[PDB]
Amino acid sequence: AVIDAINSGATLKDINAIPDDMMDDIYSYAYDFYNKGRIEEAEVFFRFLCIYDFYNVDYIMGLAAIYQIKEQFQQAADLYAVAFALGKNDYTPVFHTGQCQLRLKAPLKAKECFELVIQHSNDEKLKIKAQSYLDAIQ
Amino acid sequence: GSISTAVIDAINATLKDINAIPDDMMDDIYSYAYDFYNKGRIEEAEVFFRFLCIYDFYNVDYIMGLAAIYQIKEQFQQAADLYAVAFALGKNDYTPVFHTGQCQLRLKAPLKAKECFELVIQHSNDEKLKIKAQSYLDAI
């Protein structure tokens, strides 16, 4: 049954391979490892989650955050672009992409990211953070 | 699909990481993909754009070509998802937002579509695209 999803490209979530409440528990445990600084374990758990459902925006954001913490900034930025697309109107991944671009020495790209947050987002606290980066970029 | 390939690659080096296909060859394959597309050979064009997006997913031109094919095929959610990737990457115009609005209308999500068309009117400098977006808004 699982092999069928491997051959059809479907997710494990599409075939309800693990119950909903158990997946919730695994996501909460992943976030616990993350908040405790247990980065290697959080990375295993967020990779597990993204294998289970690679369209879940919160699962992708968790793995992207791990990569950003590990200073794998391009790999983080790649996942953030997917996370943005799947959620359509949440500019948090665009904000974090701006941070990654600064670390990649691409300040004009970073400015474009933070400006996009300011222009489109309805999240006032997020826009405040984005503006503080814009104020600092030369 | 293209998005699942991108995520699996990120979970797990890639072909692009080793410069396995040079720029000029990718340019040629892109032009061949549109040759198929322009002749109505949509299935072959889809294979070629999928090939391009496996090699270099984070490329606005490849993403936009594949999104157009899904919209024509009435695979509206897949099209909307790819248009949003194109916009996030830096696509310097609001055309992917406009087309996402069209897709959301077909998905019976008129409130999502309204948000898309309103973004076009507020932020695009393409006066013709703005008129088109307003005509959809007038109908919602």
Ligand SMILES: CSc1[nH]nc(-c2ccc(Cl)cc2)c1C#N
């Ligand atoms: C869920 S309401 C909504 N707000 N913004 C969008 C949006 C933004 C950029 C792009 Cl490229 C496509 C769509 C959207 C949708 N769908």
Ligand SMILES: [Cl-]
């Ligand atoms: Cl959507």
Ligand SMILES: [Cl-]
């Ligand atoms: Cl730059």
